[PDB]
Amino acid sequence: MTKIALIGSGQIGAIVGELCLLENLGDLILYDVVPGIPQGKALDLKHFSTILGVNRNILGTNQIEDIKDADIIVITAGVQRKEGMTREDLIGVNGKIMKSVAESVKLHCSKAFVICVSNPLDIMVNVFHKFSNLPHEKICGMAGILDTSRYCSLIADKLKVSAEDVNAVILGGHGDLMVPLQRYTSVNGVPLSEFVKKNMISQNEIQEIIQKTRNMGAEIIKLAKASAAFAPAAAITKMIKSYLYNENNLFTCAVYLNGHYNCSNLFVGSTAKINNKGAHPVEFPLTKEEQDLYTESIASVQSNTQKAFDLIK
Amino acid sequence: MTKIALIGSGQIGAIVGELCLLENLGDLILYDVVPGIPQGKALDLKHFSTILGVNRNILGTNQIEDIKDADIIVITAGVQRKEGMTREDLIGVNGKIMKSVAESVKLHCSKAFVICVSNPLDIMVNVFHKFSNLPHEKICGMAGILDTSRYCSLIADKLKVSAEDVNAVILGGHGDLMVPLQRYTSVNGVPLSEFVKKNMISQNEIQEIIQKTRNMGAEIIKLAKASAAFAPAAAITKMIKSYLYNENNLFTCAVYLNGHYNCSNLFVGSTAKINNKGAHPVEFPLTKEEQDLYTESIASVQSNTQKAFDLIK
Amino acid sequence: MTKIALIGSGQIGAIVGELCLLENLGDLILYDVVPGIPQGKALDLKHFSTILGVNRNILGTNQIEDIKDADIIVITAGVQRKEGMTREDLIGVNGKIMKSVAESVKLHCSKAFVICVSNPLDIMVNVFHKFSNLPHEKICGMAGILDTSRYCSLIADKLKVSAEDVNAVILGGHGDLMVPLQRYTSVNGVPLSEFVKKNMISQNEIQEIIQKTRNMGAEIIKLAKASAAFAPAAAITKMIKSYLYNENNLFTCAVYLNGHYNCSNLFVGSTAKINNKGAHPVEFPLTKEEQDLYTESIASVQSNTQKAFDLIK
Amino acid sequence: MTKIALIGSGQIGAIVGELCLLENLGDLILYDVVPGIPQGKALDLKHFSTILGVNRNILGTNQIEDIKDADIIVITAGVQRTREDLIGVNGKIMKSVAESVKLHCSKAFVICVSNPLDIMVNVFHKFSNLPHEKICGMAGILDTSRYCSLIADKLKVSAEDVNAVILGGHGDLMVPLQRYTSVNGVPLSEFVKKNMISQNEIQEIIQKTRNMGAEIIKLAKASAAFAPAAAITKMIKSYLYNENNLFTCAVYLNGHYNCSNLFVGSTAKINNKGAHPVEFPLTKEEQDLYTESIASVQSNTQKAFDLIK
Amino acid sequence: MTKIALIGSGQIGAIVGELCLLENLGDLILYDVVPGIPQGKALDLKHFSTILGVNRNILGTNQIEDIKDADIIVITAGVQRKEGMTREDLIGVNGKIMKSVAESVKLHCSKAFVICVSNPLDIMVNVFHKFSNLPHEKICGMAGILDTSRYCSLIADKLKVSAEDVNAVILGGHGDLMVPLQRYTSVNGVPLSEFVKKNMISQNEIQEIIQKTRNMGAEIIKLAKASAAFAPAAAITKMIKSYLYNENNLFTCAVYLNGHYNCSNLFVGSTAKINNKGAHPVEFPLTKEEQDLYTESIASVQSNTQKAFDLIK
């Protein structure tokens, strides 16, 4: 009975649709502006479903009114960046697209939970909130689960441990101003600081890893000639799951801050829980230095958001 | 310990890599000729693995010698057809690529099981056997599972039943001369003929379905502007699973015929079992009319396979 | 949000609860009459859930009113048979228990889909219908999927093939009068009759297999000193999945016949589809000899159902 | 091709077999001393495998020589449950199983589960003649799942990414480490500062973790079976897929945590080559508690060897 | 080619034969035990046929073997009640006659559809089923259509409307325990309850009408000194037409209940469809009070049916 609407049928959207089918999360509605594309991917997904013994319904469509009564909305519509570009270079063209999608969600399914993925991520979440007229808890963006996966992955490789239970908090905008928190990094519970004391990893090695984490999105673009699609989709699917199954998992994602971390009235990457009712920020006690870094990331997001609202007229 | 080598890091390869990681089938070796592309898709797949709690090793490489000691080899290297083209139009350019891959497999990992996917499928399997010097049971091509999934999917939709236990045999080349067998179609055990007698489906509706099955590959190209990727990858994975886990499953795939179905010395789509030791054809009793249709399909594959050998000089 | 209520917290109920947690099918309500048993198994299941990263809610209870608003009800309450006993020997004691459970479902959650499992299976489904006041499509019993799995498993072994795509129809009561249909047995689409023509299996070997399928329930009791628990639970879970996910799968189960197969006003093992709306019988064209065997099975179920109603006063 | 041998076909063994089938880990060999039991559970399990589309091979047997060439061995043989009788009755059984593994499949990776856990792992090592990295016992994972589950409930969070380290014997002398408890990376101490949980609530949780195994016996009238089996599976997975995951399990210490020549619950990585201990920097107070748990295990292990004559 | 056999050539049988001729329903076989009577009525009916241009064959006979290969059988054999008698007073004499007719139908034309009319109706249908060995859907009794005509006729008179499209359901035995359903009474689609709201008829007037409907059979006997013949024949002919022409019309008639309306293993007046395959009960949702009344009627039929079986030894 659950309806999952993918607004954008590109790489990310299709794989999200594929992952949703694998766990039987819901019926799919594959929407795109370009005719034929969602219908074709829907056909390929049905044949996939038939081989793997999944039976959920899959509808490829160019009529955005088919998004009606979606329980979940994943928004990937928009352009992606190429080599040499920053995420922020998409601000002009994607803001306009995000506004249009916001206006459509507003009239067709105002009760949905909305996961935004168009870049630049934090900014585009703010745009969606402005024109959608949905409650702020019902809107979020994925990024932090992606950036955390890259940072944990690298930490795991340097410590010669499984990535499976390397956990971390990354605060701030999905960009060059991310703030990975060493204090809030653990390896199956054990703080990262223990592994520095045991000489298994050095402060310099960690700064190196933080740098690779920041650039990773660009590095994949450079190597693969396309932007990361599998990891983003997995992250998204994890956030859909936490909503549908009322799991109340504690992630980083772009969420409405409201007095938390000295910030108010802005969607930005932060610690949050996701459950039945949406995405709910949680404030943890930062050090002065940590908070100072975070606030600096928050300032860019503020600026670039305003820039976006301006460029939309 | 199992090594799975994906020769070709395009759409199909990457998704196959994805599905192998989801079931922990083995460590991945992502190979492509184009520099950077495998390394980037490996990075994205690592991050995907970290988020889903899979821990297998993933290596993106341009050095084909990294394929050494692969247990499994999936070949997608080659060009894909565009709108208006037939699969057979690729014969010239893909034959040459398949030969080169054959030669590399020959010197680097002669003990592997080899699933060919490059088009036109049956033809390219015959090229790979010629220049690879591997036993014929250790080589096959995936197609029948994809064509079957399409046909069964359509049968299921018309009968208002789950596709989950709709099974069927499609013989012949992956092309316009497929031979779907009504007699060998069942719905959780019940032959298709019972549903015609019960007036739940008509002989004309079935012929319509057979036509859509034949043209499906082209239809997806037309709609999606790219060829099918998810369903092919799922089919491939199913054949990998049947080899690794010695399952002895009965599929249709491009296999070496040797006195079966009045055919010898040719890889062509047929009923086969896959296990530990490779792909083994099985002959079932066809009617005169069925065999005639099958022989006709076999003839095209014969011709076009000769053409492919000729055009390689 | 989905609530799955297990009326009976023995072996079968707990394993069904386990499988439902593995696929995230819903929140569990474990009910039993015996104090402390459901609470303890619930604790074990929560810890199991923690290890495997499942997060659904699990409540062990002795208050049957906790069953309120269950979407799904699985009934295993009742006594199981020992060595030397038939399923029919339980008629007296389990009929009374089934009536009590029927009455409780009637007042506490009349909108649920109800899978009966207490023996003798077909008879107890009829008892539940009588005292529950639920629509007949919302009530069924699992047996045919179990018997079919046994018969298909044995056929697969003899043919040296994967059981994975061996499908079959078994009609009739869950007992010595089952009617496995050779005509409706296939191996990945290929009818069983093709394998007899190819001399891979004989008519005698098939009769032997039918006999083992009939006695299997008793043979496991003899060997294991307890009745089968894992396969029953898997079957049950497969029917739950078909209902929750609106799959419309075609099984055999105990279902309300209404002019189908010359039978009316009786729950008995038959071919049926399960979807959103419940269990719906489907009639396939039987031969005279097949229908005669089926009618004979139906007659026992008739007699024994009457016996059960009589013994309830 | 992988062969998984379940020495003991009771509740735990069967469910382990069930979980192995669900992930296609390997062919099963179900062994028990009682005739008929394994054959019957094997039949059920084949039917279960048919319904769920798994195809691995399952053999029920009473001939221990069928254990030959097992890549993995899970030992649940023994009685569940005067303590000098437990340690008394199961020590003898464990020795007999050790001897059999010695002659029939010396290359196997061995997970011991018979109680009292730690003690019995040490008995297995003494009479099996297998390398010490190839032997371990599951217990930590189970105690950690209980503790993390309770923490998660109190904090109103998913248990999914609550991780923790619990050191020491599987018993009243467990040492849960608050410092090594996190919630998707965030240390438990941040939640006490935020007043989402109190030090007393934690001590309460530690106590319930210690008594859990008894509480389930009391309530269910049988010992826990589903969680133990999941734990065991998780270790099997880490070995077969060379995952190198960091668990707490009973493992051979050798200069780690001031302890040498003993199997005891400790932080370890499991891969292709077996279980390998890893030492983390404990505080004095933490190490003191851990040493105390290690002393019991020492004493009782001696007791066990003594009672075996 | 259709053969219609009238077992009993009294008033009803002859008139049924007349109506069947008028609509060309089939060739007639007029059977009676009394010599000469069927031959003489057959002569009169031939001459009737000649005048009205009907050309079906008509055979008057005392040899019951002439009933062979009848497609339809109408049983009016038996004694009719006089003034002061109930229908139940015939139980002794007619039960024995019905059994004898049952035995004859059994050996001479087991494939026929059988409409029983001898009184007391419901009881005598049950006797025929017991000794005939015919499927229960191939046996029914006419009564409800008669009682309905009477009730509808009286409703029409009081509302000053055509009886033509006044329809109703009357459940239960053909006797003093009939249950006419006000809820299931309509005037060309408009429920009876609309006419009470409009003050065109009162609840008391309706109860009066129900009473006259119950006693109508006796009132005609008192006035005409013979029992009703024209209406019974018309009703019978309507049930013949529905069978021959596969009309699937929804009547009330004595039909085999099998879990419908909390009743099993008894022929009693109920809602049913008549088609090619026979008479098939249909259960509609009754109120508690309606069902209670119906059950009470079913109880008498039960008792008297037992009485009938007893008196037959």
Numbering used by the authors:
A (entry chain E), B (entry chain F), C (entry chain H), E (entry chain K): 1 to 313
D (entry chain G): 1 to 81, 86 to 313
Article sentences:
Malate dehydrogenase (PfMDH, EC 1.1.1.37) is located downstream of PfAspAT in the cytosol of the parasite. It catalyzes the reversible reaction from malate to oxaloacetate using the reduction of NAD+ to NADH, thus aiding in the maintenance of the correct redox environment, crucial for the parasite’s survival particularly during the blood stages. PfMDH is also involved in the shuttle mechanism of the TCA cycle intermediates (malate/oxaloacetate), necessary for electron transfer from cytosolic NADH to the mitochondrial electron transport chain, a validated antimalarial drug target. PfMDH is a globular tetrameric protein, where each monomer is comprised of 326 residues, which form 9 alpha helixes and 11 beta-sheets.
PfMDH-WT crystals belonged to P1 space group and diffracted to 2.4 Å. Molecular replacement yielded a clear solution of 4 tetramers in the asymmetric unit with R/Rfree of 0,25/0,26, respectively. Similarly to other NAD-dependent dehydrogenases, the active sites are located in the cleft between two domains: an N-terminal cofactor-binding domain containing a parallel structure of first six beta-sheets (Rossmann-fold) and C-terminal substrate-binding domain. The oligomeric surfaces of PfMDH can be split into two major groups: AB and AC. These surfaces comprise 1852.9 Å2 (AB) and 1372.1 Å2 (AC), respectively. The AB interface is mainly formed by residues that belong to alpha helixes 1, 2, 5 and 8 from both subunits. The loop region between α6 and β8 of each subunit (residues 187–192) was found reaching in the hydrophobic pocket region between β7 and β10 of adjacent subunit, facilitating the AC oligomeric contact. Analysis of the crystal structure of PfMDH showed that AB assembly is highly similar to that of the active E. coli dimer. Significantly reduced specific activity, decreased thermal stability and a shift to a lower oligomeric state observed for PfMDH-V190W and PfMDH-E18W mutants suggest that tetrameric assembly of PfMDH is crucial for its catalytic activity, although the AC and AB interfaces are well separated from the active sites.
